[PDB]
C-alpha cells in the first residue's frame, strides 16, 4: 500500500451534489507547530441516494497546511463497513472514492475529522495565517497566529532542532538542527547527537545509519523559522568538519575552523534510521558545547520528541 501509486476508473465527482454541508477548523488562537501543535479539520455532509461506487468528492486543503506532519507520508482515514476511501492529490487535496455501501443504501450521511499541520515550506515565518478548507461551495476560514517561537540559548551557546520525514516502513527520519542561530562567537564548538536520556528511543546512530550534512550560514536572515531548509541556499562544508561516532548511538561534529571559533550559524541535516525491530520511538538530544571569551566550558542541549494523531470518520444510512 503506497501513496505514490494511484488507481482510477469509472465514476463521477459528486462533490457539488453533497447536501447539508458543514466545515469547521478546530484550533486555539495560536498554533505552535514545533510544540506538536496542530489543527483539526471537521466535515459533515449528506450524500445523495443517486451515488454509486467510484463517485468521488473533493476536500480542499490549503497549501498552508499538510496532513502528514512529522511523518513522511499522509494517511487519510476511511469513512466507515467502508463508505469511502481517500487519497491525497498533487495539489494537496483529498479525493475520496465511495465504496459499494452506497449502491444499496439511501439517506447516507457522514462525518470526518482530520488532523492538519502548518506546512514548513509555505509558512516559513512566525505570523498570522488565515487557514481555508472546504468541500465544494462551503469553505471555512480561521485566522490563527503561527508561532515557531525561539531557539534555546545558554551563555553564548544557541541551538534548536526539528524532526520530520519519520517513515516507519523504511525505518528512517530526518532531523534539522540550527547551530548558533543567535550569531554568537563560539570557540571550540562541538555538537553531539544522542538519544534522549532515560526515554524510550529507537534511533540507531552510527556511521552506517546516520548521514550528516553541515551547511554554513553566511546570512542568518535566510534561515526559515519553520526549519524548512533547502541546501542550495547555503554553503556545504561537510568535508571541512570532523564527523565521528565516538560512542554507541552518538555522533559528534567538530566545526574545526582555522581559528577554532565560529561566528555564524550552521545547519546540520541528519538523515538517520530507526531500529526495524522496535516500536520506533524517536527521542533525541542535541548538545552544543563551547567556550566563551572567558574560556569557561559550557553546553546547551535541545531535546526532540514527537506526537502522532489520527483522524476519524463515521457514516450512517438506511436500507432502501
Amino acid at each position: 500500500g503506497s501513496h505514490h501509486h494511484h488507481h482510477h476508473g469509472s465514476g463521477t465527482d459528486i462533490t457539488n451534489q453533497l447536501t447539508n454541508v458543514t466545515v469547521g477548523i478546530d484550533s486555539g488562537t495560536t498554533v505552535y507547530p514545533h510544540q506538536a501543535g496542530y489543527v483539526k479539520l471537521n466535515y459533515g455532509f449528506s450524500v445523495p441516494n443517486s451515488a454509486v461506487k467510484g463517485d468521488t468528492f473533493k476536500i480542499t486543503v490549503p497549501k498552508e497546511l499538510n496532513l502528514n506532519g512529522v511523518t513522511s507520508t499522509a494517511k487519510v482515514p476511511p469513512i466507515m463497513q467502508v463508505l469511502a476511501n481517500g487519497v491525497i492529490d498533487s495539489d494537496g487535496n483529498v479525493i475520496y472514492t465511495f465504496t459499494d455501501y452506497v449502491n444499496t443504501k439511501c439517506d447516507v450521511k457522514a462525518t470526518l475529522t482530520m488532523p492538519a499541520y502548518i506546512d514548513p515550506e509555505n509558512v516559513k515565518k512566525t505570523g498570522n495565517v488565515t487557514l481555508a478548507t472546504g468541500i465544494g461551495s462551503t469553505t471555512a476560514n480561521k485566522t490563527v497566529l503561527v508561532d515557531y517561537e525561539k531557539y534555546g540559548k545558554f551563555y553564548n551557546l544557541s541551538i534548536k532542532g526539528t524532526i520530520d520525514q519519520i517513515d516507519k516502513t523504511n525505518n528512517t527520519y530526518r532531523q534539522t538542527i540550527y547551530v548558533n542561530p543567535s550569531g554568537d562567537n563560539v570557540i571550540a564548538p562541538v555538537l553531539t547527537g544522542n538519544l534522549k536520556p532515560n526515554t524510550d528511543s529507537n534511533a540507531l546512530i552510527d556511521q552506517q545509519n546516520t548521514s550528516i550534512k553541515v551547511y554554513k550560514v553566511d546570512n542568518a536572515a535566510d534561515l526559515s523559522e519553520s526549519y524548512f531548509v533547502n541546501p542550495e541556499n547555503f554553503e556545504d562544508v561537510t568535508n571541512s568538519v570532523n564527523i565521528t561516532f565516538p560512542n554507541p548511538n552518538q555522533y559528534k561534529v567538530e566545526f574545526n575552523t582555522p581559528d577554532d571559533q565560529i561566528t555564524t550559524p550552521y545547519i546540520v541535516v541528519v538523515n538517520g534510521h530507526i531500529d526495524p525491530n522496535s516500536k520506533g520511538d524517536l527521542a533525541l538530544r542535541s548538545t552544543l558545547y563551547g567556550y566563551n571569551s572567558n574560556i569557561i566550558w559550557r553546553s546547551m542541549s535541545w531535546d526532540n520528541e514527537v506526537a502522532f494523531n489520527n483522524g476519524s470518520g463515521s457514516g450512517d444510512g438506511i436500507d432502501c
Partner: antibody
Amino acid sequence: QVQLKESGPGLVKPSQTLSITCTISGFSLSRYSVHWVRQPPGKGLEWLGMIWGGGNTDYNSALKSRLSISKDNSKNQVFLKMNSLTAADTAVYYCARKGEFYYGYDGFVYWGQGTLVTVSS
Amino acid sequence: DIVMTQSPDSLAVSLGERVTMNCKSSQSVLYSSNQKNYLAWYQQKPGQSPKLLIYWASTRESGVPDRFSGSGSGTDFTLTISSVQAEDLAVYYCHQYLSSYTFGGGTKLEIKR
C-alpha cells in the same frame, strides 16, 4: 614545541591503584584533548580514553569501570588512574595529542616516550 | 567495535624491494557522507613511541619518506614501501578513528636470507 612526558611508578602491586601523570608543554591543555593509550610487551596498542579541553572524558568501554582520567590545566598535568589490576595491565602507557586543525581529526600525532608499568607482587 | 586485522603477522623483506602490508576492517571505515576513510598507519621501533606515517588512508604525513604510500577504501587497505631501507625494519600498525579508536595486531618486517 608541543611535548608530552609520562611519569609513574615502575612497579605496582595488584592490590593497588595505578596512578600515572602526563606532563604537557607547548600548548594549552584547556584547548586540546589528550589521549591515553597502552601497549603490553610484544602486543599491539589499546586506546584507554581521553579528556577534552573542556574536561569531558570518554573511556574505552571495556575498562571504564576500572579507569579514571582527570587533569589540572593550571599545572599542565593530565592524570590516569586504574584499579583492580592484573598482570594484564603490565604495559607501556602513553599520553598523546592530535595534530593541528588541518589534520581533520582528533588522533595520535604527538606521543610521549611512554612509561612501563608492570603489575607484580 | 570495528575490529582491525592485519594479514601477514611477519614479513621477510629484501633491502631494496617492494613490500606491501594488508589491513582489513570488520565494518567499513569509509563514511559515505564525506567520502573519507578513517584509517591511519603507524611505524614503531622496539623502544620508541609509534610514528604516524599515513592518515585518511592515503595522506602522507609530513616528514615521512616518499617510498611510503597507502591505498585502499572501505574495508581493505594497504601500506606500501616502494623500496625497503635499513631504517624501515620495524612494526607497522593500522588504525581506525571513525568509531572510537582501534588498532590492528601489526606486521613485523624482518630481513630475508
